[PDB]
């Protein structure tokens, strides 16, 4: 009965989706699918983060409009997420009319309420190109060790950090011209005015403990004002009444969460839901799935902007850690920087969804994709525990009993053990204790395969007069499979579809209370095949 708006962080439009993105989108999708299974109104929202100087410059280098470039990357992103069955209700763009109007609205309110401050800043400027240079578009000689061809605010030889104004013989990465210091009036959001409000939220107990602790460090350091403006030339939204000034992506990007929802409402012809979810009196829940590097922004800057423009604030932030592969940060040279598109050439989506889900929890801890363990765990758990309950039993049902399951449960006590677990498993999905849910599900799968082993259908099948026993055993196993696949339905959407076709029924959370009795099932080919390390080796080689 809840109304829930759930987002993932927005992929940048100038790079391909990789396994780090997929950890976040899969985590959110599992949670979203479970909430839908429990009957809630769920809106799962994302968008490409499509503005800014890097995007402007990349399009110029490619010789195409920024609109053409971001459109092509938007399609690529959405193809990859669709390949992993990420079930968004809307995937939009920060470059949209909805976000333009909302960014202009929120800025106007912030300004009228006294939260926008004008400040003159000094920044390196390319006089040939005619633009201010972001730090990483300045290169030069490290002032400390004198190594040439260093970029931005740090030296990759001696490790020194410094302002790029300290680079020796600086050069524009764009044009090669020598940059010079130039003044410009910028507009700053007065985040420090919201410190008391944000401190109250931190101690309210809603946020993850690790996040609340990090926020205390930020309050201790002292909140700063944040620039929300950029000078032309830019790719983004022009600031009303400020010719030559644009909104910086810090302002327009999270408003894209609202723009994407407004777009969804407008496409649906729904004239009430936008205010129902975003006005201050909302009874809807708003949740952001984000990574560690996005916590400052989503926990301090964003709720402050919402408060200052008279909108509701997030109900909670759900933060995950970094992805590692074989224990280390993804490494292009080792072939462990793996694109989502590459993954799907070698493995299915369900395999990675399962593996990540088995490792995830409600804490901020890095998640390791150990590729040897991936092969072992998928084969052990999906092929040999869960799918095995269907594959070892369905053949006898189809070949000797015309596809018909027994009229009664062979072991109702065991079945109740399985359905009694729904409360703890569902609470684990709800609380984002995904690894706990999977551990409980696989413990049940072990019990189910122990039951089948004890009954020994490969013996019963050869013994005269034991047809009824065989049907009873195999039907019991199939009903245990039905329950386990219901618990896994948020995790494994494609296997679930194959399971539903075999079982001739949609899997619903409450449906497990009614076993399949006197019920026709269908034949199937292979519900899920084994994987091997040769495939892992090919994935790594393809990614180098
Ligand atoms: Zn140096």
Swiss-Prot record:
Reactions catalysed, as given in the entry: tRNA(Met) + L-methionine + ATP = L-methionyl-tRNA(Met) + AMP + diphosphate
Cystine pairings recorded for this chain: none
Protein keywords: Aminoacyl-tRNA synthetase, ATP-binding, Cytoplasm, Ligase, Metal-binding, Nucleotide-binding, Protein biosynthesis, RNA-binding, tRNA-binding, Zinc
General function of this protein: Is required not only for elongation of protein synthesis but also for the initiation of all mRNA translation through initiator tRNA(fMet) aminoacylation.
Cofactor: Zn(2+)
Motif ('KMSKS' region): 329-333
Positions bound to Zn(2+): 142, 145, 155, 158
Cofactor: how bound: Binds 1 zinc ion per subunit.
Protein name: Methionine--tRNA ligase
Short motif 'HIGH' region, span: 11-21
Binding site for ATP: 332
């Amino acid at each position: 009965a809840k109304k829930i708006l759930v987002t993932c962080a927005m992929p940048y439009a100038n790079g391909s989706i990789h396994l780090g993105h997929m950890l976040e989108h899969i985590q959110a999708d599992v949670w979203v699918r479970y909430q839908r299974m429990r009957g809630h109104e769920v809106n799962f929202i994302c968008a490409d983060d499509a503005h800014g100087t890097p995007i402007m410059l990349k399009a110029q280098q490619l010789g195409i409009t920024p609109e053409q470039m971001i459109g092509e990357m938007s399609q690529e992103h959405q193809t990859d997420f669709a390949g992993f069955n990420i079930s968004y209700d809307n995937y939009h763009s920060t470059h949209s009319e909805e976000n333009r109007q909302l960014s202009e609205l929120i800025y106007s309110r912030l300004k009228e309420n006294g939260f926008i401050k004008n400040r003159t800043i000094s920044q390196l400027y390319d006089p040939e190109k005619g633009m201010f240079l972001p730090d990483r578009f300045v290169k030069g000689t490290c002032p400390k060790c004198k190594s040439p061809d260093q970029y931005g605010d740090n030296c990759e030889v001696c490790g020194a950090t410094y302002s790029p104004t300290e680079l020796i013989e600086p050069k524009s990465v764009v044009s090669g011209a020598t940059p010079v210091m130039r003044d410009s009036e910028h507009f700053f959001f007065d985040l420090p005015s919201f410190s008391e409000m944000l401190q109250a939220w931190t101690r309210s107990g809603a946020l993850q403990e690790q996040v609340a602790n990090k926020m205390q460090e930020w309050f201790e350091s002292g909140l700063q004002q944040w620039d929300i403006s950029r000078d032309a030339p830019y790719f983004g939204f022009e600031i009303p009444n400020a010719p030559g000034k644009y909104f910086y992506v810090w302002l327009d990007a999270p408003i894209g969460y609202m723009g994407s929802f407004k777009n969804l409402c407008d496409k649906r012809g729904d004239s009430v839901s936008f205010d129902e979810y975003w006005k201050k009196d909302s009874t809807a829940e708003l949740y952001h799935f984000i990574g560690k590097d996005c916590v400052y922004f989503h926990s301090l800057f964003w709720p402050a902007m919402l408060e200052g423009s008279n909108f509701r604030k997030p109900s909670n932030l759900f933060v995950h850690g970094y992805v590692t592969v074989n224990g280390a940060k993804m490494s292009k040279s080792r072939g462990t920087f793996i694109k989502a598109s590459t993954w799907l050439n070698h493995f299915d989506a369900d395999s990675l969804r399962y593996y990540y889900t088995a490792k995830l929890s409600s804490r901020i801890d890095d998640i390791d994709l150990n590729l040897e363990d991936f092969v072992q765990r998928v084969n052990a758990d999906i092929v040999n525990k869960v799918v095995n309950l269907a594959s070892r039993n369905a053949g006898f049902i189809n070949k000797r009993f015309d596809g018909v399951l027994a009229s009664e449960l062979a072991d109702p006590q065991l079945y109740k053990t399985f359905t009694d677990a729904a409360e703890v498993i569902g609470e684990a999905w709800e609380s984002r204790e995904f690894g706990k849910a999977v551990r409980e599900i696989m413990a049940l799968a072990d019990l189910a395969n122990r039951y089948v082993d004890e009954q020994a259908p490969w013996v019963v099948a050869k013994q005269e007069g034991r047809d009824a026993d065989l049907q009873a055993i195999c039907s019991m196993g199939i009903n245990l499979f039905r329950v386990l696949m219901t618990y896994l339905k948020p995790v494994l959407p494609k296997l679930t579809e194959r399971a539903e076709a075999f079982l001739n029924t949609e899997l619903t959370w409450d449906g497990i209370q009614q076993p399949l009795l006197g019920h026709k099932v269908n034949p199937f080919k292979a519900l899920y095949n084994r994987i091997d390390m040769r495939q892992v080796e090919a994935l790594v080689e393809a990614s180098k």
